[PDB]
Amino acid sequence: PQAHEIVIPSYSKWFNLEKIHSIEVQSLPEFFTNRIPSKTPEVYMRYRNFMVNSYRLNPNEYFSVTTARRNVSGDAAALFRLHKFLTKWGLINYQVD
């Protein structure tokens, strides 16, 4: 499948799929306590890369919370918040037109 132009806003060139930045541990502090076994960094990266790698397969099309809580197990509210973080930073849904 021919890949199209990855396009995020410049204040987010810091995002890297294979690591967790500082801004993410401050914005989404529920996966970074060490007290909830179901919410760690390893699962954070899954939830987060699936949403991001999904939206990039076709960036002209809104990726949604429903298609994320269908595919991945975890608190839907936690996934609502992850979805909105990534929307703020334009890492999700930046081009939906």
Partner 1 sequence: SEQLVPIRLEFDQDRDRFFLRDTLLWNKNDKLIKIEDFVDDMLRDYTREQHIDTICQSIQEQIQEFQGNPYIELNQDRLGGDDLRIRIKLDIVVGQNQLIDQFEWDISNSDNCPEEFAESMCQELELPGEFVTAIAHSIREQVHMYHKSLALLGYNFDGSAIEDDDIRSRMLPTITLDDVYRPAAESKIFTPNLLQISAAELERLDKDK
- Chain residues binding partner 1 by CB under 8 A are 29-31, 33, 35-40, 42-43, 46-47, 62, 64-66, 69-78, 80-81
* Minimum CB distance to partner 1, residue 49 (Å): 10
* Minimum CB distance to partner 1, residue 25 (Å): 12
Residues 6+ apart with CB under 8 A from 62: 93, 96
**Cβ(67)–Cβ(76) below 8 Å:** no
* Minimum CB distance to partner 1, residue 3 (Å): 21
d(CA 76, CA 19): 23
Residue closer to partner 1 (CB basis): 38 or 58: 38
Residue closer to partner 1 (CB basis): 14 or 57: 57
**Cβ(92)–Cβ(52) below 8 Å:** yes
Residue closer to partner 1 (CB basis): 13 or 70: 70
Amino acid identity at 58: N
